[PDB]
């Protein structure tokens, strides 16, 4: 399940950076950015392989990728934030 909806502006500022890189189709800081998210545990709605893709949300001071990510869904304006390494998600609302 998805925890609820969150405004982009209520997320860490790095989330805004990640969405900007997704809109420009990169370049991305990490090689894992853009990989398919399998959603193996069906925390997100179950969809065909390739529906979802994952991108790092940089954590200030973290040596490498930390635990914050954006998952895109294929539908327009469909994006999810996790701060806990895919355990929980909120729908991102870029309008606020």
UniProtKB/Swiss-Prot annotation:
Keyword Disulfide bond listed: yes
What are the entry keywords? Disulfide bond, Endonuclease, Hydrolase, Lyase, Nuclease, Secreted
List the catalysed reactions: [RNA] containing guanosine + H2O = an [RNA fragment]-3'-guanosine-3'-phosphate + a 5'-hydroxy-ribonucleotide-3'-[RNA fragment]
Q: Name one GO molecular function term.
A: ribonuclease T1 activity
EC annotation from Swiss-Prot or TrEMBL: 4.6.1.24
Q: Which GO terms describe its cellular component?
A: extracellular region
What EC class is this? Answer: lyase
Catalytic residues (UniProt): 54, 85
| Cysteine-cysteine disulfides | 7-96
Give yes or no: UniProt keyword Metal-binding. Answer: no
**Pfam families given in the database record:** Ribonuclease
Localisation: Secreted
- Outcome reported for the amino acid change (mutating residue 39 to A/D/S): Decreases protein stability
Q: What SUPFAM superfamilies does the entry give?
A: Microbial ribonucleases (SSF53933)
Q: Which family does it belong to?
A: Belongs to the ribonuclease N1/T1 family.
List the protein's name. Answer: Guanyl-specific ribonuclease Sa
């Amino acid at each position: 399940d998805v925890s609820g909806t969150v405004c982009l502006s209520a997320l860490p500022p790095e989330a805004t950076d990640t969405l900007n890189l997704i809109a420009s189709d990169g370049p991305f800081p990490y090689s894992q950015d853009g990989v398919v998210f399998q959603n193996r545990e069906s925390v997100l709605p179950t969809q065909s392989y390739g529906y979802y893709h994952e991108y790092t949300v940089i954590t200030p001071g973290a040596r490498t990728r930390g635990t914050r990510r954006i998952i895109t869904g294929e539908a327009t304006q469909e994006d999810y934030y996790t701060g806990d390494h895919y355990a929980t998600f909120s729908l991102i609302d870029q309008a606020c």
